[PDB]
């Protein structure tokens, strides 16, 4: 009976949604912890955390058999994964846009932009630790990321989520980093 | 080279959105026209426009491969179709819930509540032209849609959409029709 | 020199916008006024107000020289004008979609849809007076507007804006005018 | 026939909207591409992209016969064009307010204001690479734009839109770039 | 001392608000209690409750020295008082428009309109108990109120508020009560 | 550690909230089913359902050990319990305002008002089944309920939830029922 | 006869409200105008506009005879007046909370809080010019307004409305004016 | 007779609401005043106002017996108190998380984030008057509140309130302070 079909379907969907929440939740805990680690220096720890998070992403990819919902929740989680990943990669010199994950275009671009602000914070801590070279290479990757991401601004911001705004944010932060670098050189006299 | 990949994919999605937009718009125009005819009396042509629409629906059933969109846009047209169909089925005795259209539970359910309103408008017009039989049968079906759909009200609003509110609206229309019918019987 | 230009254009547009605001609001007021004067029985005085409005309309058309501002403000006052005119034509048997003035299409459509409800007012009141004939005619024109209008719901928003909501409004209004027509037929007796 | 005229004009307008939107988009993709090129150095290809865009402005101007939709949708793209142009001029030492385009005054003013931020970014990036010269000339055009622009904010916001905020932003950048300049000066005694 | 004057007046105003609110509340509790009494039949105690309420109107009028807060908050209670009064007058055969209170015109008009629904309720409940008389006299005052009141809706809604809606409601009840009347007539041939 | 305390606390609260949702959910299913039963005639069935529902209310009352949340969700459920109960009681002649449950004043008053619209629907079905006496006694209890509930209008509607509006609704409905009765007598000729 | 009265009062209030709207808006415009004229350097012309405003204010005070309408519209224009005056007094060393005109307390407080941001504008621009003295003065008065105002956050809304929001606004503005002041002290050098 | 009972209970609730309203208002005046003094320099009197406030808090701790309200109104004041307290603790070296106040987890956490802003305002003022030691210690505490509080972000927003957004705000304030401090060191 079509009503019993749609009823069964609805229960499937509900249970689904609940566990999906749980998974995405754990994944985001790992992402975040990872970023805080990198920030505080403990990058091996970070790597391991990220690894856990990717496994969890496999469990997530499992759920796309119900495309209604799923995307209605995943995005956030996904971005931060991307974000955190790029972050390790940047502060390790192994930075690349060649992150081969099962992720949506909007989540990918926004995670990458999200990493910019992270790199500003890092470059600030280094700047204050009187380390100018790390700061400067961070700045280099900030810039790189921005310059390359703008290419996508053309697309309707509905299609690409809140990119344009995010990028303007990034941009202004990049400039602030640069002003700071200069001020740090003068102030290291 | 990835960035080039996610960009090709974006271009796709844009094309697909434009196309789905136009499909669904067409399909709606038909569902709408179908209803307007069922009211106007030309039930045959209603069956026609309806068929055209369902054909367009099977044309919609392609873009599942683009789940990043699809569902989002689809609902309000799917729910529209489900409405018109049910309406026809009630205004030709053949009222059933068991129709297969592969439509999101929400657009299904809500499409059926959505029907009740169109039923009370009909029933009322018939009541004005004397037809108490129409009106009585409609009161039967209307009460059935309500009695049945209410079983799904306990579900999280996030999946069943706003079924409860649509339902209460219907209920009230049912009462107002029962009442409009105890009148008129004063001839 | 460039800036001198765009500056002068600006000052011009400023004074223009002020005046446009005054004239538009006076027009709208006069439109509405006429509509309520009909519902109050002073249909002649209502003709006087509607006249005043249709006059001010001209002075409003004179601001099309400034397509910057002319359009961001057009909508509402003229929606009301269309309403009042639709109504007048309707309560006077010679109702028509053919009203020889444009006036944006959105304003036009929303205006008719908005005159549906004033028609219900007039029809329930005609029902109270006793007169079922005029009541049935008003119910006819109401239904007609609803049908002829629903055809444009296809079009997206932006171009159409109000329509869908205003037509579901007019709809529920039509159901009520009808129910009232039925309970009205207990005469019949008497 | 009133309902049929309106249906016609409706179809026309939606079509026109689709087109205008795509073309505006194009003009914009080139505007942005251009500014990126300037920031890269490739000023030649920059000027080319500008060219393509200003070609597009023709196709766009072709739509001011539908004033509804035209003065709504047009702002962004135009305003950003003016930005690209004014930017490029400023970095070629050939900065002027005497750009001539069929363009809404808001879009114009806002285009210059918007250019100011791009100047500051260029001026910092140079001032990092040492070029104290380029920097100072940039700060110069910056203050220029802010100073002459500020007298247009005696206009009611609705005529002038985001100008205020932009000038606020502008103001800030100016004051900051100054500091940055000075700081690099003492930085490169050593 | 400007900041100190302002704090003073502030404290005064908040206090005045607390008081006005409580007193208005009182006046209202009696207004409602009154209408309930009339619906019960106990017209004596009805008249008493009216008394208590109109006594309260003194304490309330005492606040129009703070026009800020007074003309905002006052509407409901006053309006409902005029309702109770007009209602009781109508059912004592002594219905008049010549209530005299220090009361805002919106509140006044709205009070009469509001009374109309209470009349319809009474008229139905009598017409159920047979009293065809009481019913018909009620319908009479109903039509009176609607008919006189309708000429006030030539006023812009902001001055007149809910009147229109209430008159809408009113109109409805009138037309329906008529029906009901007739239906009971044929009902009690048998 | 105060941080770990507030952490543990937060987990407790979360689990709590989840199961409380489940309970209130089941309760409301029973309420509603009960009302549809009574409407369709099957009042013994209805009784049993209501019984289930009260047991579930015991399980709910269990949770008041976390008064933050709880009330932030219960209300709805509670009202309908009240509503449905009064409803059986009214159509059974055993109507009373003496429903002795562990319920909030606002839930209680609003449930009771909510029952009025139910009784209108009932009295309409009876009216159409040409049964005028049941209609009339229902109308009697509608009226009684209203008349008695108004007494509470005085209280600030924040304190008593959306009572006043609810009562005006009820009122108009009562009048509609009455017009209908009359029209039913004339139309039974 | 009663209705004749409350009718005449109504028509009176209608004309009055129209005229009040015009006068209020003109006043507000003139206030704002003055403020932007100061931020554009034409402080004398700004003196002229602010004069015009303070004059129109009187004609506005003349409408206190109609406490129905006078208060539902008071707020915004006078908030702006208070703003422009506070600002004038502040950019002219002789700043004071003691401005000998009331003017509702809400309008007063919100007005000062809203002048905080115009003060930051003036202070950042003063910082750009080079002048740190006047900058520090402005920063003082800003901070002073913030402190003297926070004292009123206790009071509920209704009486105060805007406050807490506008003060968190002013706050973040003060932090920015400060940060700018610090990076401004790289002169010091030069 | 029940209806009379629930009526008495209502009257109660109204009374309790009025009273709680006034208590919390008083308490917030104090918390606020306390902060304003900590900024102004009168740290002692800040300790005083704070104490009066906490006394009023133990006065608040009665109305638990009226859960139908209480929590609802309390949060924004409780969260306020928690703020002021933490602020004092940081501007006198004695910064700790471990304080007992029996306050809703949300008002606790969000109170501590709330603190960071006041810290950056302080730190900035000190930075203007030359005090780099103040500012540096504040940068330490600020970073600590952020680092620690971020552990609770994974929780449903419905229980932890909007902690994440408040936190990002703070973070940004921390950067802008680090930056404002790399300046000024240019003397
Ligand atoms: Mg981040
Ligand atoms: Mg730019
Ligand atoms: Mg009433
Ligand atoms: Mg119910
Ligand atoms: Mg704070």
Q: Could you give the CA distance from residue D41 to residue D173 in angstroms, rounded to a whole number?
A: 22
CATH number at residue E23: 1.20.58.2140
Which of E102, E105, E97 is closest to E146 using CA atoms? E97
Among candidate residues C168, C133, C135, the one with its CA nearest the CA of residue C150: C168
Helix axes B105-128, B132-149, angle to 10 degrees: 160
Q: Resolution (in Å) of the shown entry?
A: 3.3
Residues 122-181 of E with CB under 8 A from C: 150-151, 153-154, 156, 168, 171-172, 174-176, 178-179
Rounded-to-integer distance, Cα A168 and Cα B2, Å: 23
D73 part of contact set with chain A, CB < 8 Å: no
**Chains interfacing with B (3 or more CB pairs < 8 Å):** A, C, F
Token output for F22? 């489940």
Distance from C-alpha of E149 to C-alpha of E97, rounded to nearest angstrom: 10
* Alpha helices by DSSP H, H92-162: 105-128, 132-149, 157-160
How far is residue F11's CA from residue D177's CA, in Å, rounded to a whole number?
50
**Which phi and psi angles does A156 have, rounded to 5°?**
-60, 125
Q: How far apart are CA H38 and CA A113, in angstroms?
A: 39
Secondary structure (3-state) at E44:
helix
Q: Which domain holds residue H24?
A: 1-187
Report how far residue B135's alpha carbon sits from residue B91's, in angstroms, rounded to the nearest whole number.
Answer: 10
Q: Which letter does DSSP use for residue H64 in this model?
A: G
By the 8 A CB rule, do E181 and E139 touch?
Answer: yes
Of H164, H138, H140, which is closest to residue H151 (Cα–Cα)? Answer: H164
Which positions in chain G touch D163 (Cβ < 8 Å)? Answer: none
Tokens coding F55: 């047991």
- Closest-CA distance, B179 to chain F, in angstroms, reads 7
Query: Least CB-CB distance to F17: which of H7, H13, H159?
Result: H159
Written as six digits, the tokens of D24 are 């505006």
Answer whether E122's CB lies under 8 Å from E84's CB.
no
Burial class (CB in 10 A: 0-12, 13-18, 19+), B83: buried
* DSSP secondary structure of G2-63: THHHHHHHHHHHHHHHHHHHHHHHHHHHHHHHHHHHHTTT-HHHHHHHHHHHHHHHHHHHTT
**CA-CA-CA-CA dihedral for D16, D18, D19, D25, to nearest 10:** 140
The CA distance from C54 to A37, in Å, is: 73
Contacts of E179 by beta carbon, 8 Å cutoff, 6+ apart = B183, C183, C184, C186, F179, F183
Burial of H78 (C-beta count, 10 Å sphere; 0-12/13-18/19+): buried
- Which residues does C68 contact at the CB level (< 8 Å), separation at least 6? C13, D71, D104, D159
In chain D, what residues touch G130 (CB-CB under 8 Å)?
none
**Cα(E181)–Cα(A45) distance, integer angstroms:** 86
CB-based contacts of B174: which residues, under 8 Å, 6+ apart?
B116, B120, B139, B142, B143, B146
DSSP state of F101: -
Q: What are phi and psi of C64, to 5 degrees?
A: -80, -5
F83 assigned to a ligand binding site: yes
Q: Which residue in this structure is represented by tokens 């030309």?
A: B42
Tally of domains within chain G: 1
SS (H, E, C) chain C: CCHHHHHHHHHHHHHHHHHHHHHHHHHHHHHHHHHHHHCCCCHHHHHHHHHHHHHHHHHHHCCCCCCCCHHHHHHHHHHHHHHHHHHHHHCCCCCCCCCCCCCCHHHHHHHHHHHHHHHHHHHHHHHHHCCHHHHHHHHHHHHHHHHHHHCCCCCCCCCCCCHHHHHHHHHHHHHHHHHHHHHHCCCCCC
Tokens 């415009």 — which residue? Answer: G29
Burial C1-29 (b: 16+ CB within 10 A, else e): eebeebbebbeebbebbeebeebbbbbbb
CA distance C181 to C151: 27
How far apart are alpha carbons A122 and A38 in whole angstroms?
A: 9
Instruction: Tell me how far apart the alpha carbons of residues A133 and D32 are, in angstroms, rounded to a whole number.
Output: 31
Q: How far apart are CA H176 and CA H173, in angstroms?
A: 5
Nearest CA-CA partner of A168 in D121, D139, H175 = D121
Would you mind telling me the total number of residues written for chain B in this entry? Answer: 187
The answer to whether C10 contacts D105, with C-beta atoms less than 8 Å apart, is yes
Crossing angle of the two packed helices C132-150 and B3-40, in degrees rounded to 10: 150
- Nearest Cα to A65, choosing from A27, A111, A19, A29? A19
How far apart CA B30 and CA F75 sit, in angstroms, is: 44
CA nearest to A91, candidates A151, A131, A51, A148 = A131
| Residues contacting residue A132 through CB under 8 Å, at least 6 positions apart | A126, A181, A184, A185
Q: Does residue D65 sit in helix, strand or coil?
A: coil
Least Cα distance to E113 among E139, E158, E145 occurs for E145
DSSP letter (8 states) at residue F95: -
CA distance F37 to F41: 6
Of B148, B130, B141, B139, the residue nearest B179 (C-alpha):
B139
How far apart CA A91 and CA A68 sit, in angstroms, is: 37
Contacts across the F-H interface (CB distance below 8 Å) = 72
Q: What is the CA radius of gyration of chain A?
A: 19
- Crossing angle of helices H71-91/H132-149, nearest 10°? 140
Q: What are the residues whose beta carbons fall under 8 Å from the beta carbon of H162, sequence distance 6 or more?
A: H110
Specify whether the CB–CB gap between B181 and B135 falls below 8 A.
yes
Contact E27, E56 (CB under 8 A): yes
Q: What does the buried/exposed string (b/e) look like for D104-129 if buried means 16 or more CB atoms within 10 Å of the residue's CB?
A: bbbbbbbbbbbbbbbbbbbbbbbbbe
Rounded-to-integer distance, Cα H22 and Cα F134, Å: 52
Structure tokens at F180: 């209908």
d(CA D158, CA B65): 45
Chains A and C touch (3+ CB pairs under 8 A): no
Instruction: Yes or no: say if F84 and F58 are a contact pair by the CB < 8 Å rule.
Output: no
Residue among C29, C33, C124 minimizing CB distance to E172? C124
The rounded Å distance from CA G89 to ligand 5 centre is: 29
Q: Decide if H52 touches A, using CB distance below 8 A.
A: no
- Return the closest-CA partner of residue G82 out of E6, E65, D164: E6
Name the 3-class secondary structure at B127: helix
**From the list D174, D176, D185, which residue is nearest G183 (CB)?**
D176
Has H83 been labeled as part of a binding site? yes
CA gap C63, E135 in Å, rounded: 58
DSSP 8-state secondary structure symbol assigned to residue F121: H
Residue H172: count other Cβ atoms within 10 Å of its Cβ: 15
Subunits adjacent to chain H (3 or more Cβ pairs under 8 Å): A, F, G
Count of residues in chain C: 190
| Subunits with 3+ C-beta pairs closer than 8 A to D | A, C, G
Beta carbons of G26 and G79 less than 8 angstroms apart = no
Q: Which two tokens stand for residue D162?
A: 């985001």
Joined tokens for residue D20: 């205008």
Tally Cβ neighbours within 10 Å of residue H141.
20
């Amino acid at each position: 009976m079509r009503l019993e079909e749609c009823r069964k379907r609805l229960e499937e969907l509900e249970a689904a949604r609940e566990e999906l929440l749980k998974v995405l939740r754990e994944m985001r805990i790992h992402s975040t912890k990872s970023i805080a680690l990198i920030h505080a220096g403990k990058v091996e720890e970070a790597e391991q955390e990220l690894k856990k998070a990717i496994e969890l992403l496999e469990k997530v990819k499992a759920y796309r058999e119900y495309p209604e919902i799923y995307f209605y929740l995943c995005n956030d989680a996904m971005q931060e994964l991307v974000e955190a990943i790029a972050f390790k990669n940047a502060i390790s010199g192994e930075f690349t846009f060649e992150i081969d994950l099962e992720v949506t275009p909007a989540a990918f671009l926004n995670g990458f932009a999200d990493a910019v602000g992270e790199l500003r914070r890092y470059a600030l801590t280094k700047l204050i630790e009187g380390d100018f070279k790390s700061a400067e290479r961070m700045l280099e990757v900030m810039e790189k990321i921005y310059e390359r991401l703008m290419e996508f601004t053309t697309f309707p911001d509905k299609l690409v989520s809140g990119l344009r705004k995010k990028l303007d944010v990034a941009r202004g932060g990049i400039e602030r980093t640069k002003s700071d670098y200069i001020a740090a050189k003068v102030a290291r006299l």
